[PDB]
Amino acid sequence: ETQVWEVWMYSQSEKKHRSKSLKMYNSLIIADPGPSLAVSDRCVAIVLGNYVALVGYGSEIF
């Protein structure tokens, strides 16, 4: 399925909000996000069907 996902963030250190769109064309995933778990202080992994989203900022992982 095509999917209009909604990325966003709100820093406490900056007290600031921002956001991004995240298209997902032809995804076989159907499930809601979660269970979630941060993969680091700067980065998080989250369940999305069998697949797992990985997101981060300032990360050395990238």
Place this chain on the structure above:
Amino acid sequence: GWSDHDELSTDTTLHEEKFRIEPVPVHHQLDILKIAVSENYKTFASVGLDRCLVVWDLRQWCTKLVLSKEQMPRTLKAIALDPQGNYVSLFSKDTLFILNVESPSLMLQHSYHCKPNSKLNVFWMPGTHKDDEWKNFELVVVESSGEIQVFSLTIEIEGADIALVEKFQLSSPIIKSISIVSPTANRIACLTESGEVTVYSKKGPVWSPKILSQNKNYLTETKKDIYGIAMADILFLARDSGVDMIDLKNDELLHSFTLPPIKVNTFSVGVSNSRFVNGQFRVSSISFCFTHAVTEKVLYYYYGNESNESYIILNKWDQQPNLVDVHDPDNSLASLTFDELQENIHEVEDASESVMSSDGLYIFGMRRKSSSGIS
């Protein structure tokens, strides 16, 4: 989350530049069930609905291990990992597996006690240590029965060795409990459905339970949930009347941060900048995940000031006056009495699934506003 091509709006800020998001192409045949993670962050492990096992490295981005379902037993009630992340444990209802990943070999297999179908909970505990040259572990096995198993498990590269040690049998069915290892000593928290908060603690050979004092003012409350910071060995404790922040070992209640009533199964805490100066364990900032009890909006209260505005004398390593002379850059920062901590509101829709960062510094999450077919 595969799609034929993911996309996001082109960034105009360095605030978003380092911000990034990537797939791991490797996957379960079918949707995820449950997972567990190493403290090192380098290691990761996962299981699907098909209960295939997968483990993966985070920084080196290279495959570590894969296991198909038919290699595995029909029942798989539980899962657990060592803090090093160098080894793996699995609980089929009748017998546990212990397998290395970095050096894939059958380190051990061992039958163990169970009382089906009461819900499992599990905790690893590192020994006197000597990795890699020699090792040991202390397998806690919490149960909804309120039984709490503990096992010896000395292990060496020669081949994992095993022996049972003790069977705790705590009163009443349990809401929650967690491991808490101070560098000085092992300790383990234990909430009851009764709301009792016992803690076993390892005085070496001694393994002493102790009755932590939830105090008289709100004893009757159904708890939401206790949560703490094991590296801080500090006990936060949910109540609608105000969370406890009780001390361990020498043990005392300190203070209760002012809060809105909060939904059960929600409470958790995170902190920036771990350090252990002068025996103290101060952190740069603190933050507070929980779903709201009523409005049910996601909520993450913040505390601390910073970047240079404040330093957190969380607890005191010794609740005594002290004059040890070593450099304390934090003294240049303003002292924090509880009064100025000043929570920072940011109520948000539940629909945006989201988590507080482990350091508590940053919010992250997503939701689908909409989706559509190939047509």
Place this chain on the structure above:
Amino acid sequence: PLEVLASWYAADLLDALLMESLSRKVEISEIEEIISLCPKNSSIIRHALLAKLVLFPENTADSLNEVLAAYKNTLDLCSQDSVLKINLSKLFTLHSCLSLALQRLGYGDVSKRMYQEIFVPDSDADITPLSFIISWTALNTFAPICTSENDVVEKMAMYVRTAIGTLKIQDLKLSRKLINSCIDIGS
């Protein structure tokens, strides 16, 4: 040539009536409309009766007769005018639909042991709403009794979870099917 097109309209009229049986409470008057709208001995006339046998437990005995009569009829006018053409998905479809019909008739002392040996297909595009409604309502009607093999509930629940193809409403509902499958994994 006409009854072909009548069979088409009754086909589309049934595929739409089965998907409404999950959100709303649906009544026999809508099925008998499809049955009379259908032709004498067509393809969709057999599937319509199955829908009746599945969607209405208060009318299973009388319904089971009408199904087995329409099949005892399809067979008589196959030899008397002779090789069968059934695929695995329509085998599993009749398979489950019978066991569900016999649980509703009290012989569940038998209907369980029949449900235990059902060959469940895999994941594919082909999956008519008739076979979905049967596989769903049969999974529900056997989710509690079947524990004393137990492979079917998990395999059958995965059959339902492993597909949709239609807009959510019922987004949290399918997710509830997922979590129920999860606690089924947690058994």
Place this chain on the structure above:
Amino acid sequence: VLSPLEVLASWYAADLLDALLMESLSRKVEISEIEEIISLCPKNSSIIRHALLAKLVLFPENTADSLNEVLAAYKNTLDLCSQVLKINLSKLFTLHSCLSLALQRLGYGDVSKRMYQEIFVPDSDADITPLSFIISWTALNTFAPICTSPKENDVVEKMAMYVRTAIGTLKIQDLKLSRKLINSCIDIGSR
């Protein structure tokens, strides 16, 4: 996909199996002979199931334990069939009536009779094997005193005309079973 050694094993087994079915009609039969058969039959063939369906019918205390394997072989023959079926009328009828027979020997009666009454007996063609005959004989036997009661829609008449036509095309020996069969026709007409 079968070698050239097991094809002969199946032909040899199929003749011994046919021999045991017709011999079971005028002599006293046992399983000891079927164990030798199924073991002689190669490990994944049609003859396995025929050897099993014969064991299901010819051994009634072993119904429970021989029905196990009849389903096992069929759930296994289905297992590889995907990892389209084409069944014959007489094959359906054979399995149909053989299950009805196995259920009555279990203690279902009602369920055994209703399945029996919905059996679709084939017309009268060349598809007449001693197994299909032995099943229809013993099933007519254990069911003629039960389905003959309710009167309206029954196959008792059609079933007995099947075992008729059957005896005169193959076994051709002799007046023995033919007398009992004509007596069965008497059992139907007098009913």
